[PDB]
Amino acid sequence: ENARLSAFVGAIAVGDLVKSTLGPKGMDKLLQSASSNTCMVTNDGATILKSIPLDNPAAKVLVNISKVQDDEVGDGTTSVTVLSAELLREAEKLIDQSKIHPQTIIEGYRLASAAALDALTKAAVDNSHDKTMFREDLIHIAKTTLSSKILSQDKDHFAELATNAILRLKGSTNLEHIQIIKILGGKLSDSFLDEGFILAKKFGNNQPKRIENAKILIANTTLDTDKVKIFGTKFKVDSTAKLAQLEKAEREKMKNKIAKISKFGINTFINRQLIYDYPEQLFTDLGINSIEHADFEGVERLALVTGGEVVSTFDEPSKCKLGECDVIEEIMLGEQPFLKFSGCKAGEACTIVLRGATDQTLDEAERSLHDALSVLSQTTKETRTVLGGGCAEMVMSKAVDTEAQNIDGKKSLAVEAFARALRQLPTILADNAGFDSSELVSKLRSSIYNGISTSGLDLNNGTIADMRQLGIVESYKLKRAVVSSASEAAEVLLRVDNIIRARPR
């Protein structure tokens, strides 16, 4: 009974110290010791929480949350605890007059956070305007990162491949969308950018090397010689020919798994393990080509470019997520066959093939390319801001109200409670500003409700003004960092039905 109070009400008192310190006009706190002459006055939230000894065993959970946020960026650490405190404050009404399962409330936050991030993306602005000057400066920055690296030999050709590897993505800039192949017997100057998804291994023997109107399906199973370790078994049979009957009976059962594949109408199959000749020979009449040695990234990255799924099982026939590609071409370079795909539907990715003269040049070029692409990918999350001053906080409340329309009975009060915590951010910022927070937040919701999505709250004039004319913006990367940190921190706390005090070190 007291575990819920210490995890909810007890966690508010921890966030109350950083509640009034948010913002440049926010208040300050005092840290006093026994001697009282060592004290100091500062607005830093991370210093106050770590300096004050906390006897509350549930308060130590929020300590590790601030440490993860500080690694990403040193700004917004205070806003993480404040936003997480508003979700725990409204959790009291989620119990007494609600009686809703806590995990269902957490699952409602994932549906609300999905619409909140999409609402901020459409309203996000950037300084990338006049890209002619912006795109030209991208190649000069990549050349500066080439110092001490073997790629410094040619700055123009090597940095040009890294420039087109970023802007042409039109999506997530993470390295998971970039494929790197290490090969031998060539020069680094011959490297080029190709989106055909080139991998080392080949597939098939008598099958043709060109496929038109291909249908790609991704699955993971072993259809050939399961139980790879035969040591220890005991085969009791009356004759030698009777021992092979069990292996022949498994071949007849393979038609059940092949029938589900043939009903999908796919000419291309993906397999991590090998395939026996008999199920492979039956694929010749159906024209099914199986690709082997897909590793892990090759399984996930193929589903991203072709719009597939990573599930290895079939839950129901004629229902699944299928991809496709126009042409599959197999070429040979460097005395090894290569696989170059063509015509992938909505395919967005790039593959930089590094051809070195030895193994030492391949490992140094791959590690140096990731550092060069990290700086170019950082420019997407840097300098890009959004309209602040209550604007972005209120816009997220509109996307939550959209999901609050069509909802079940359990998550109805959970999604609606999340919209109240979003309006608490401009309320607290207006508290230390010296003005009335209830009047500014109320008039802000009615204005953005119908039209005028760029409006915000002005701290100087204490009224609603255009944020584009005032020029008050906040970083978009900071918005996602706080929401992602608050979603993971509140996910553990709401699931707590009891508190186990940690052992002191």
Partner: protein, 501 residues
Amino acid sequence: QHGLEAKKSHILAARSVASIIKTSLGPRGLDKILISPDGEITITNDGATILSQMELDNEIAKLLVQLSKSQDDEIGDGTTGVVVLASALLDQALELIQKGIHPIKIANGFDEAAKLAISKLEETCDDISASNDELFRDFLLRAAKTSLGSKIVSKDHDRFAEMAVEAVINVMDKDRKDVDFDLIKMQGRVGGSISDSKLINGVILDKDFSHPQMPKCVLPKEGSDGVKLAILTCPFEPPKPYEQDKFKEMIDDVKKAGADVVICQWGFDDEANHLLLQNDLPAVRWVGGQELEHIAISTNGRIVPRFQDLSKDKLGTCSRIYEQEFGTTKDRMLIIEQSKETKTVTCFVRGSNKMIVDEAERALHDSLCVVRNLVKDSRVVYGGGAAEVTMSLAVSEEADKQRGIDQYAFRGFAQALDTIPMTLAENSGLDPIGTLSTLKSKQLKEKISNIGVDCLGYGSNDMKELFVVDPFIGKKQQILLATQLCRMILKIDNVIISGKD
């Protein structure tokens, strides 16, 4: 304590401990923070770790730790299942005492009720190899996905599902079906990510091969037989009841026998690394006595007591030895594999944080115990709460045909099995009473099947479409230990606690 006192207190003492783990039961439960006194910090929902950390003076809850210690070797994942099931039997046993039934009748009454329910579950059980052979691979892959869904491992779970399949098979035989936990090594280090984790078929020893000039990869040396390793049970030092001359005599026995690497229990001097550097013969130092057995078994080696007893037959042979740099860690450990099936398997998992490594280590180790029970019995049953509902309806229906005093002991056993689906229904956000009546109605008028409580959000019954199966030997081991525990509790009518001096 007396009869009118302790018998009433033993029931209330078990309900306080059982009610703590009822919230953490299932994948939707709570992950608790626990810190061992040795300095290890990890977060897991495993009941065997949570119950082991419980320190209390009540003798009723101490039997839970004693039972979970022996159950950890057999299964280890059924700790939360047995405690809740055993506490359900004590709840119905309290009412039988007030009716004038001796407590020994309750202990002997559950023995006939447990054995009768086993034969009823076997009739409705299905077999894997006797039905579909190609689905045997998918059964082992999706078994670990349920336990790993509550952890960060659930993102990469597709690749890690195959690693747990080969780790169990290597240490067991198809006919014998014997798996030892001491043969499966669970290790991990800080740094890197989980995507670089690979399976190791041999020991590790965390050796950097001393001076870096030594080759990091062992060559086959013109098609030789494996890679010969030396095992020495004697320390490196000159014989005592000239020191450089004795060093040249001991290295000759290694070169003549063909041992590439030398493993010893005691440290080496600085001159030893100078002579071994010219011959490209890496050395191994500070190896425990327990780890010496796993090397000779996997590499097919022998224990050589003396210096001159070396020979090609007593040297352990492996596939190859290579030193692969892992991230920025300066340890630069080794990986020793083997072509043939060995008895030693070492799991190697990396993580960006120390708490992440220990979180995924015990989560992956629990997946090895689930696969261990699946390969022990080819026949599996549908779990998720369907096993407790089906076995309860068989005992409750046959209770009317069995007369005598045990007639009421059978009704209490059927109602005690309903505690599991009602507990999981509360953790899933459903009515525990409404779901229990719903599962019994669908299995009676419609058709006989196994439908349990929904672990994931869905709109209706019949989880059989999701192909969620549990091992028969795993579920049978839980009801046997829960029945034996309930009998042992009734055999202690007095609590004797001595004072302190």
